[PDB]
Motif scaffolding. Structure first.
Motif: not given
Ligand SMILES: CC(C)Oc1cncc(N2CC[C@]3(CCCN3C)C2)c1
Ligand SMILES: CC(C)Oc1cncc(N2CC[C@]3(CCCN3C)C2)c1
Ligand SMILES: [Mg+2]
Ligand SMILES: [Mg+2]
Lengths: 211, 205, 203, 204, 211
Positions: A1-8, B25, B61-62
């Motif tokens: 989920d942090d990996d999701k954050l970085h991708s974004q 993502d 999440n944003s």
């Protein structure tokens, strides 16, 4: 989920880096590849000689200004963006009778090699005499597609195949397709040293009750 | 009152002052349909016109916040133009879809978004049989135009289309309406392409 | 010229509201004036109405002291300049068409009045319209997204105003009412108020 | 080159919250009727094409031509200026605009705006297939202003028929645009309108 | 690399030309008048409606004019002699059909060609419904209709409206139209209207046609 954050985060930075092209020229020509998927012949009007088609028009081109290194952006290899965010070609039907109606979101896919894929679904009315549509031989109509303002020396118009993709043609259409081709044609005009390409959609069809 | 207003304007400002999903993502979008009317069945062109409410839900999440830091605000309404929304499209429409309701979404503090557009859709449908006991059956697929299953993972909550708001005096009665979560894949490749298939069996009332 | 500057000033001040909430709810009063039943289509069970929809609400954020602005007690302004409620027909079959300018009147006590003329196609079975007893149809109007706890929907009267109904319409009106109702819908937990226009008509 | 810079400079210097009781405006209205396109007896709607001439004057649009290269007028987008909310009171469809949305402003502050429009409005065409013809009427005025903010004027009470299409399906027997000032018993304000009344029949 | 560099430089030069012209015209005036040349190419008579006396045409409307403010020296911009640009980026004349019965529908991209001498060429395809009695279309003599085109708001002292020919171009007329063209002309006229003191020029399209 942090990996999701970085991708974004990496996508936001890529889009900023790319977006924060004046079209082709004789000195900087662009290849545009076109292909059609015919989904339905909706209506054939013998009182006005207009036929209405639904199709998906695949357009692909490549720009150096849209290239990136996936390694500098977390291995992002492609992204989606509004077709308004980018240059798009002025490919037009040359014998429409009504403004084309767009049936799909206007969103393109951009890949790290700078290639852009844009596939608008469209409902088009165009000039067509449907005489013979109620016969075994069927009717034949044709519409040309090409750039409105660019010659072949600026937009080099290509296809991947002479065959219109019929694998999604509506199986219970009022009209059955006998054949559909998308041959490419060049015309040399008196006014110009430049050649002008078009891709002509030619559809042979008949009433499903005519066979 | 003035305080609760300044808390909300502050929340919106903080949130609004998303590039879409990607393979790394991915976003889940849940879809469900409320069928309100079959308006028109045109046997001359094999087009049928439906009116339905298309419930869409997803989470970002944003768009998350702590209600305690914002006056115990737990949700708000906002123009759908203020947020990212998914490109859910009928795959066999024959006219551009017509939107019948205000384009307003509800955002909740867990980052979840609820958006329920009312729409009129003309789509490809042969109504042969509609004037019989057995009726006619048609189907239309809804899904992302440009995202595969790696970017938008499409889900349903139920396969039962909501008919509780269906117009009791329609020209057409519903024999059944089902929404299936379907997908197709090319064997060569990992990508899967999901859709929700709306299947409606109907007949002249 | 002073009056112009006073109005420009007042509008700057007011314009340079996030909508109602459960902690800051809003009353919206609705009234309908029916001008014409244009078309009744028995092939699709759609009827077409032309009506004016009077909307009224009041916001503290739109209040001012007239003495502080040249005795200005109200002004006209584009409805895009202010928040407006999301009042919608719940059974339309085509996007509603607006036939009038979208201009609201704002009064110094913060009250707003907005009266769009509209043409609406909606779900309606016109069977019996060619008889003495006529056809009866109904359409609900309410917020699309706000529950009763956010927008309280009121009326000033239970009767639709027919005093401007077109006297040479293809259809005559036998009755027209606008009662208030409260409904729970399957999508959602909260109860949603509406105003239901019920019209009896005949050729 | 200089005349362009002066015009650009004029417009910049110039670029209004609308009229009030303290700052009222007069709009002069006139119609040129080009065509009765369709008379629909199944819905009692008639479709007209006309040109709607609108003229008003704002002090805030005045300038001295001598301060701007002797410029006496200019063309501008109707969206660049305030325009009056003159509306047909019994339309049944949104009006369709048939001409470019451009106004001419003159140095005395007068504005001229002439949109060509197709209007569907409420009208029973019973009689159109007879010698006497049919008659229909539609009132035009402000949607939100009274006569104390916007007064109406006409230059004539006869509709201009000089551009009426000679081979229309319908011939015009008469066409008037009388102006009315109505005082309702309830209220002090006067409410002006201009009523377009047209008598017409199928051309034989 | 050289070839790729040369493309980069021609792009830069075009982007720079467009910035110099656009990012650094208020229309014609009696003191600064403009010639606009018009010509029509008639592609199809789609529909003739005897119930309302409306006829529907598809045509290309060629418009040409020249602005001093659009001139440049090609030697100052990598020898660029012309470029394509969105018609939204430039001033365009308010040429209008005077007897349309529905808003004109645009069928093509709206893109102009601008040439280094300041001339502009803009050629939109349009579908027009206009006032026309088709009585006699079912006969050997056919029907005759006319529609005037001209500026809505500029008089002859501001826009001087010219043609290159009195003949409508029929070389692209749809061979299987419901309607055959017997003749098509585009003569110029000067007219006084009751609203206004000035004389306004038009180009009148007159078309004789039959089933
Ligand atoms: C959960 C709620 C706060 O968010 C919503 C968002 N869009 C539509 C709706 N609704 C609620 C019910 C409905 C159906 C008819 C109009 N309306 C009130 C649509 C609700
Ligand atoms: C008086 C002029 C400076 O201002 C105008 C503003 N709008 C329309 C027009 N006109 C002039 C005459 C007319 C009728 C047909 C199109 N045209 C040129 C409309 C004039
Ligand atoms: Mg991390
Ligand atoms: Mg270099």
């Amino acid at each position: 989920d942090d990996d999701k954050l970085h991708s974004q985060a990496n996508l936001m930075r890529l889009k900023s880096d790319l977006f924060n092209y004046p079209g082709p020229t004789k000195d900087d020509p662009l290849t545009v590849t076109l292909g059609f998927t015919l989904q339905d012949i909706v209506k054939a009007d013998s009182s006005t000689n207009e036929v209405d088609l639904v199709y998906w028009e695949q357009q692909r081109w490549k720009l150096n200004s849209l290239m990136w290194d996936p390694n500098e952006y977390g291995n992002i290899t492609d992204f989606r963006t509004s077709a308004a965010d980018i240059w798009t070609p002025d490919i037009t039907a040359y014998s429409s009778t009504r403004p084309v109606q767009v049936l799909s979101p206007q969103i393109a896919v951009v890949t790290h090699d700078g290639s852009v894929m844009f596939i608008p679904a469209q409902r088009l009315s165009f000039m067509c005499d449907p005489t013979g549509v109620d016969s075994e031989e069927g009717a034949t109509c044709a519409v040309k597609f090409g750039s409105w303002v660019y010659s072949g020396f600026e937009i080099d118009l290509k296809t991947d195949t002479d065959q219109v993709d019929l694998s999604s043609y509506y199986a219970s259409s009022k009209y059955e397709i006998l054949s559909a081709t998308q041959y490419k044609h060049d015309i040399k005009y008196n006014c110009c040293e430049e050649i002008y390409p078009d891709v002509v959609l030619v559809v042979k069809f008949r009433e499903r009750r005519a066979g």
